[PDB]
Design an enzyme around this catalytic site. Structure first.
Site, mmCIF file in Angstrom:
data_model
loop_
_atom_site.group_PDB
_atom_site.id
_atom_site.type_symbol
_atom_site.label_atom_id
_atom_site.label_comp_id
_atom_site.label_asym_id
_atom_site.label_seq_id
_atom_site.Cartn_x
_atom_site.Cartn_y
_atom_site.Cartn_z
ATOM 1 C CD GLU A 1 35.835 -11.997 13.233
ATOM 2 O OE1 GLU A 1 36.105 -11.357 12.194
ATOM 3 O OE2 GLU A 1 36.435 -11.765 14.307
ATOM 4 C CB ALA B 1 -0.805 -7.373 2.561
ATOM 5 C CD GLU C 1 -0.622 1.247 3.372
ATOM 6 O OE1 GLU C 1 -0.370 1.286 4.602
ATOM 7 O OE2 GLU C 1 -1.011 2.262 2.756
ATOM 8 N N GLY D 1 0.598 -8.671 7.121
ATOM 9 C CA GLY D 1 0.373 -9.365 5.864
ATOM 10 C C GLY D 1 1.507 -9.145 4.879
HETATM 11 N N1 LIG Z 1 8.470 -0.871 16.844
HETATM 12 C C1 LIG Z 1 7.579 -0.795 15.886
HETATM 13 N N2 LIG Z 1 6.679 -1.744 15.770
HETATM 14 C C2 LIG Z 1 5.770 -1.521 14.739
HETATM 15 C C3 LIG Z 1 5.795 -0.393 13.968
HETATM 16 N N3 LIG Z 1 4.751 -0.423 13.067
HETATM 17 C C4 LIG Z 1 4.139 -1.576 13.295
HETATM 18 N N4 LIG Z 1 4.719 -2.291 14.322
HETATM 19 C C5 LIG Z 1 4.281 -3.612 14.782
HETATM 20 O O1 LIG Z 1 3.907 -4.381 13.627
HETATM 21 C C6 LIG Z 1 2.901 -5.367 13.944
HETATM 22 C C7 LIG Z 1 1.819 -5.388 12.853
HETATM 23 O O2 LIG Z 1 2.400 -5.409 11.557
HETATM 24 P P1 LIG Z 1 1.838 -4.370 10.422
HETATM 25 O O3 LIG Z 1 2.222 -2.947 10.797
HETATM 26 O O4 LIG Z 1 0.306 -4.486 10.359
HETATM 27 O O5 LIG Z 1 2.700 -5.002 9.253
HETATM 28 P P2 LIG Z 1 2.350 -4.745 7.717
HETATM 29 O O6 LIG Z 1 3.430 -5.466 6.938
HETATM 30 O O7 LIG Z 1 2.413 -3.270 7.295
HETATM 31 O O8 LIG Z 1 0.967 -5.507 7.557
HETATM 32 P P3 LIG Z 1 0.015 -5.235 6.344
HETATM 33 O O9 LIG Z 1 -0.738 -3.926 6.487
HETATM 34 O O10 LIG Z 1 -0.988 -6.342 6.363
HETATM 35 O O11 LIG Z 1 0.696 -5.219 5.006
HETATM 36 C C8 LIG Z 1 2.337 -4.944 15.308
HETATM 37 O O12 LIG Z 1 2.600 -5.944 16.281
HETATM 38 C C9 LIG Z 1 3.003 -3.604 15.614
HETATM 39 O O13 LIG Z 1 3.205 -3.375 17.006
HETATM 40 C C10 LIG Z 1 6.845 0.630 14.146
HETATM 41 O O14 LIG Z 1 6.986 1.668 13.520
HETATM 42 N N5 LIG Z 1 7.701 0.296 15.120
HETATM 43 MG MG LIG Z 2 1.040 -3.232 5.892
#
Ligand SMILES: Nc1nc2c(ncn2[C@@H]2O[C@H](COP(=O)(O)OP(=O)(O)OP(=O)(O)O)[C@@H](O)[C@H]2O)c(=O)[nH]1
Ligand SMILES: [Mg+2]
Ligand SMILES: CC(=O)O[C@H]1C(=O)[C@@]2(C)[C@H]([C@H](OC(=O)c3ccccc3)[C@]3(O)C[C@H](OC(=O)[C@H](O)[C@@H](NC(=O)c4ccccc4)c4ccccc4)C(C)=C1C3(C)C)[C@]1(OC(C)=O)CO[C@@H]1C[C@@H]2O
Ligand SMILES: Nc1nc2c(ncn2[C@@H]2O[C@H](COP(=O)(O)OP(=O)(O)O)[C@@H](O)[C@H]2O)c(=O)[nH]1
EC number: 3.6.5.-
Lengths: 426, 430
Positions: free
Chosen positions: B247, B92, B64, B137
């Site tokens: 290493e 996703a 996206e 996703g």
């Molecule tokens: N530390 C940290 N954790 C993040 C951040 N953004 C998302 N998370 C963690 O990512 C997890 C969820 O994943 P998504 O952010 O939905 O991953 P995505 O790949 O963008 O998923 P989709 O929208 O389905 O494509 C959660 O458990 C969040 O706490 C960030 O900027 N920093």
């Molecule tokens: Mg995403």
């Protein structure tokens, strides 16, 4: 980029819709003329989600307006924002639905749907990547209930993989203006359970309870009810219009919200809500935003969530806030209220966080609850239907439009099948 | 020479990337427009063009537009090459099968074409640094589609992987356990060292060490980047004991599948605390063996350690390091395996940790990143496969995965393959 096509049906659907277009035009900083007058680049970055860009930098909303009477088109076109809509997208008949579902679905709207659907094509072909359809209607009366579910069926057959997302104002026993709402609603829920990907169940009894016991409005109008609905309509699409710490598309909601295909009937809500005489004494902070958001008084269907269990809740927050504080409160809620969530799902809360709160708020939350308590809305409609149908009362008005007693029997059969599936997981 | 290609996937990977590239630019003295006012120390992370513009060796991928359109508009819009910020049209939806089979299937051959155009500029490519969410996703499904391609296209090259992994209590999604379990084939078969990190552990580290009562994600991503700056520091700088990226792995990884180390960093500290304690090599070495500083919510005392890489940086001297780890061997609460009598790999680099000027974290003369292979991490897996079991017994969201082209049997085949990893980490502890 993730375009929505919006469709308004009957008096209620065009009234909650014509208020929704005033709310999202204030957010996106669009003038009642259609011109942009906003503060910020973020308002203009995703204007394509709800509008077509046109000559002179005029933005025309991607709304189709459907009715079987001219008088609601005349009331919208003359209204606060009426001149913003495309003249070709007002699609209407002359003789109304008579509050009859069979006039909507088989006669008066079956004539008109060929003139509606070919406008839904012009908007959907003008999209770069359509994500879905956002349909506003009511389940009582005939136009929204019977033509709107005809139109859902036609758009579902033509666009099978796009999100079909409906906002559905629907009957209740203590706040009813019509004799045959149980019939019209039962014939309509039979189409929603099969075709929609999400349906947001809304009630005038719950929208009056928010106005009386939260907002303390002395004389709440339908204009005040339409304002509560349209705040949650603006809420759930926020993450495809503005940036955020956690983005959630309408599909990212559906995948988390819908455990089994047919359990897609949601109970929306909004925070903050206050009387204008007490906004001075509240702190808007996420813990107080949460304690209201999960309150049985805050939700826009008459079903008390203390008469069931949540399958999934989604809390779509807006504003500058901590992820620890949001993740803390959505944990504390479902551990301290653990008897009200299903224990075969190990976390029942989805969270999302947008960086841009509504104009004049520092924070907001839009609540979406999928709860086994929604059965009480379908159960009471079915119990009202049953009394009228056991004596065939008013059925010459439906069978005179070429309908059968077999379609009534099959609709109420499918209603009790939807009730039984929510009760199964309770 | 000594290049690393850094691939940032989904929202979590891109937003950790937007903290990593914020750090690397400060640490090498590159402006946010990619220019450098006034040694080849930058060369691991930046290609240099004849204008005197340093362009990062990174790919940002999301299915996206929203998060990468923000990178294309914020202060780093002039840093990145415009065609290595890669976006699809369609989210996703926290569905592995959209990332892997249906939506990410369209973008993959554009992503690999950019990685090829980066690898063809590398004169001696050291590895890949892959950043993602296990719960997403795009995070699970697109990373697993990408890694399968990179593991046939670049089979020799080391693939280091930095994963935000689901917590004990904190969660953002209902289907986070499904996406994480489906990912376990990726890390087992198509990765070489996989750094699991947890949001709930870093939130508790923020509360106790940084004195910040309610952190955002920007506070976490400035700690996850501080670890990769510390892993890669020996590739970028002069040291007393510089550690190569192979290493590192030859000391971390005892068996081919046993490549899921913990990581921790010290001193994580507020600038107000850092005046009232001296932060010696022995203090910061002992801080790494506290349960309080582990960035996954599991207790190292419920395991045995196999190997540690104490990657020291700044004003650290080999005397003080030997004297420190002799006390860690003295303490009976810190238990190693009978078959690793050496225990510690040590690296010592002369470059102090860089403060990001907006950050919560102190200026300090010394830091250590401890990367640590231990049996304890199997509890973070035994937490999450019990979340998967409750939902999969009901088939509780499976129609969204089956509806987007996945085989239903892949859920059984992924829970099976996770139980074989959780078996291996119990089996070597004896
Ligand atoms: N530390 C940290 N954790 C993040 C951040 N953004 C998302 N998370 C963690 O990512 C997890 C969820 O994943 P998504 O952010 O939905 O991953 P995505 O790949 O963008 O998923 P989709 O929208 O389905 O494509 C959660 O458990 C969040 O706490 C960030 O900027 N920093
Ligand atoms: Mg995403
Ligand atoms: C100084 C101050 O705090 O003013 C508030 C206010 O007093 C309160 C009572 C507002 C006010 O709401 C109402 O009066 C109201 C009446 C009937 C039904 C619903 C609302 C307010 O009018 C509403 C208004 O909200 C907005 O303007 C939002 O952007 C909103 N859009 C509109 O209301 C709108 C109105 C006219 C034309 C176009 C848009 C919105 C909501 C969700 C998503 C997007 C936008 C706000 C903050 C306030 C006032 C002005 C008093 C409240 O509403 C909102 C959505 O915040 C009602 O309870 C909340 C809490 C607020 O404290
Ligand atoms: N919230 C809201 N409810 C309305 C409005 N107008 C009517 N309703 C209520 O909901 C029902 C809607 O039916 P209606 O839309 O009139 O039937 P239709 O025009 O044939 O589709 C009515 O019986 C009213 O109780 C409105 O502006 N807002």
């Amino acid at each position: 980029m993730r375009e929505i096509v919006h469709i308004q049906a009957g008096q209620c659907g065009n009234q909650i819709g014509a208020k929704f277009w005033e709310v999202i035009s204030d957010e996106h900083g669009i003038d009642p003329t259609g011109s942009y007058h906003g503060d910020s680049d973020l308002q203009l970055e995703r204007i394509n989600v709800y509008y077509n860009e046109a000559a002179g930098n005029k933005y025309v909303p991607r709304a189709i307006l459907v009715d079987l009477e001219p008088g609601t088109m005349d009331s919208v076109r003359s209204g606060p924002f009426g001149q913003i809509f495309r003249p070709d997208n007002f699609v209407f008949g002359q003789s109304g639905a008579g509050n009859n579902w069979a006039k909507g679905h088989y006669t008066e709207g079956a004539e008109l749907v060929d003139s509606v659907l070919d406008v839904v094509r012009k908007e959907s072909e003008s999209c770069d990547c359509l994500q879905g359809f956002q349909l506003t209607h009511s389940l009582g009366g005939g136009t929204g209930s019977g033509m709107g579910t005809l139109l859902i069926s036609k758009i579902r057959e033509e666009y099978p993989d796009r999100i079909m997302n409906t906002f559905s104002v629907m009957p209740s026993p203590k706040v009813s203006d019509t004799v045959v709402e149980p019939y019209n609603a039962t014939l309509s829920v039979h189409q929603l359970v099969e075709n929609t990907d999400e349906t947001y169940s809304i009630d005038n009894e719950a929208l009056y309870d928010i106005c009386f016991r939260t907002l303390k409005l002395t004389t709440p109008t339908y204009g005040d009810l339409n304002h509560l609905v349209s705040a949650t309509m603006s809420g759930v699409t926020t993450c495809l219009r503005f940036p955020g710490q956690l983005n959630a598309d309408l599909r990212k909601l559906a995948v988390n919200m819908v455990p089994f295909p047919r359990l897609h009937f949601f109970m929306p809500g909004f925070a903050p809500l206050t009387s204008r005489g007490s906004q001075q004494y509240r702190a808007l902070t996420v813990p107080e935003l949460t304690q209201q958001m999960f309150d049985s008084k805050n939700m826009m269907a008459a079903c008390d969530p203390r008469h069931g269990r949540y399958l999934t809740v989604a809390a779509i927050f807006r504003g500058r806030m901590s992820m620890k504080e949001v993740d803390e409160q959505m944990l504390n809620v479902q551990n301290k209220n653990s008897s009200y969530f299903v224990e075969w799902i190990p976390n029942n809360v989805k969270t999302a966080v947008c960086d841009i709160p509504p104009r004049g708020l520092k924070m907001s939350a839009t609540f979406i609850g999928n709860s086994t308590a929604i059965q009480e809305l379908f159960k009471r409609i079915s119990e009202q239907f049953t009394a009228m149908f056991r004596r065939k009362a008013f059925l010459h008005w439906y069978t005179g439009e070429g309908m059968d007693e077999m379609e009534f029997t099959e609709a109420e059969s499918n209603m009790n099948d939807l009730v039984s599936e929510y009760q199964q997981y309770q | 020479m000594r290049e690393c290609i850094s691939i940032h996937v989904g929202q979590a990977g891109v937003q950790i990337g937007n903290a990593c590239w914020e750090l690397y630019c400060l640490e090498h003295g590159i402006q946010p427009d990619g220019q450098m006012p006034s040694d080849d120390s930058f060369n691991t992370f930046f290609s240099e063009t004849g204008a005197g513009k340093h362009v990062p060796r990174a790919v940002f991928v999301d299915l996206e537009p929203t998060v990468i359109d923000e990178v294309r508009t914020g202060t780093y819009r002039q840093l990145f090459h415009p065609e290595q910020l890669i976006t699809g049209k369609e989210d996703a939806a926290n569905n592995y099968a959209r990332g892997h089979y249906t939506i990410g299937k369209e973008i993959i051959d554009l992503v690999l074409d950019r990685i090829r155009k980066l690898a063809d500029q590398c004169t001696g490519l050291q590895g890949f640094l892959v950043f993602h969410s296990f719960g997403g996703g795009t995070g699970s499904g697109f990373t697993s589609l990408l890694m399968e391609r990179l593991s046939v296209d670049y089979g020799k090259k080391s693939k280091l992987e930095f994963s935000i992994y689901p917590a004990p209590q904190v969660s953002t999604a209902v289907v986070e356990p499904y996406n994480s379990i489906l990912t376990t084939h990726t890390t087992l078969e198509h990765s070489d060292c996989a750094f699991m990190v947890d949001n709930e552990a870093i939130y508790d580290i923020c509360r106790r060490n940084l004195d910040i009562e309610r952190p955002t994600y920007t506070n976490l991503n400035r700690l996850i980047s501080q670890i990769v700056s510390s892993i890669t520091a020996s590739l970028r700088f002069d040291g007393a004991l510089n550690v190569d990226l192979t290493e590192f792995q030859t000391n971390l990884v005892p068996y081919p599948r046993i490549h899921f180390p913990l990581a921790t960093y010290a001193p994580v500290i507020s600038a107000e605390k850092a005046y009232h304690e001296q932060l010696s090599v022995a203090e910061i070495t002992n801080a790494c063996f506290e349960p309080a500083n582990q960035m996954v919510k599991c207790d190292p005392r419920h395991g045995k350690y196999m190997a540690c890489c104490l990657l020291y940086r700044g004003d650290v001297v080999p005397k003080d390091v030997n004297a420190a780890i002799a006390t860690i061997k003295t303490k009976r609460s810190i238990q190693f395996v009978d078959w690793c009598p050496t225990g510690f790999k040590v690296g010592i680099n002369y470059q102090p940790p860089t403060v990001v000027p907006g950050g919560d974290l102190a200026k300090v003369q010394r830091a250590v990143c401890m990367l640590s292979n231990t049996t304890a991490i199997a509890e973070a897996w035994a937490r999450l496969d019990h979340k998967f079991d409750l939902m999969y017994a009901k088939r509780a969201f499976v129609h969204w995965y089956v509806g987007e082209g996945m085989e239903e049997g892949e859920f059984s085949e992924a829970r099976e393959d996770m139980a074989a990893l959780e078996k291996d980490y119990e089996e070597v502890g004896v």
